[PDB]
């Protein structure tokens, strides 16, 4: 993969996540434990991740191969499933994003 070429493969999968409204909204910026009133968040989630950080990394050439991008998308979902209760709104939003991602990322992975 070459840098332009990688963005063209991965960006549609990231746009598909941003397109989910309202489900993507809580993921469009880093979790802010003090704004939200969840000060234990960083005690549970060691390595935070969100759509704005993934987008910045993709735009600036920080991913060289699809697996590195996939790792950060996974990490964003895994953190939200770890911290939030299974019947909570944010957990269900996370699951919807993950279902979209599973579909959108598959053609990229099958091409490798
Ligand atoms: C990714 O967002 C979370 O994990 C959140 C946890 N509680 C929240 C309340 C409002 C918005 C986001 C979150």
From Swiss-Prot:
Residues 78-96 are annotated as: Interaction with ASF1A. It comes from the Eukaryota. Changing residue 42 to A: Impairs binding to acetylated histones. The gene is CREBBP. It is found in: Cytoplasm; Nucleus. This is CREB-binding protein. Residues 1-108 form the Bromo domain. Acetylates histones, giving a specific tag for transcriptional activation. Mediates acetylation of histone H3 at 'Lys-18' and 'Lys-27' (H3K18ac and H3K27ac, respectively). Also acetylates non-histone proteins, like DDX21, FBL, IRF2, MAFG, NCOA3, POLR1E/PAF53 and FOXO1. Binds specifically to phosphorylated CREB and enhances its transcriptional activity toward cAMP-responsive genes. Acts as a coactivator of ALX1. Acts as a circadian transcriptional coactivator which enhances the activity of the circadian transcriptional activators: NPAS2-BMAL1 and CLOCK-BMAL1 heterodimers. Found in a complex containing NCOA2; NCOA3; IKKA; IKKB and IKBKG. Probably part of a complex with HIF1A and EP300. Interacts with GATA1; the interaction results in acetylation and enhancement of transcriptional activity of GATA1. Interacts with MAF and ZCCHC12. Interacts with DAXX; the interaction is dependent on CBP sumoylation and results in suppression of the transcriptional activity via recruitment of HDAC2 to DAXX. Interacts with phosphorylated CREB1. Interacts with CITED4 (C-terminal region). Interacts (via the TAZ-type 1 domain) with HIF1A. (Microbial infection) Interacts with HTLV-1 Tax, p30II and HBZ. The KIX domain mediates binding to HIV-1 Tat. Residues 40-86 are annotated as: Interaction with histone.
């Amino acid at each position: 993969f070459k840098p332009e070429e990688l963005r063209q493969a991965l960006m549609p999968t990231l746009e598909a996540l941003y397109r989910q409204d309202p489900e993507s909204l809580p993921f469009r910026q880093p979790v802010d434990p003090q704004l939200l009133g969840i000060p234990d968040y960083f005690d549970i989630v060691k390595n935070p991740m969100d759509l704005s950080t993934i987008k910045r990394k993709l735009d600036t050439g920080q991913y060289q191969e699809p697996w590195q991008y996939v790792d950060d998308v996974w990490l964003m979902f895994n953190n939200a499933w770890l911290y939030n209760r299974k019947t909570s709104r944010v957990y269900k939003f996370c699951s919807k994003l993950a279902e979209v991602f599973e579909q959108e990322i598959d053609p990229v992975m099958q091409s490798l």
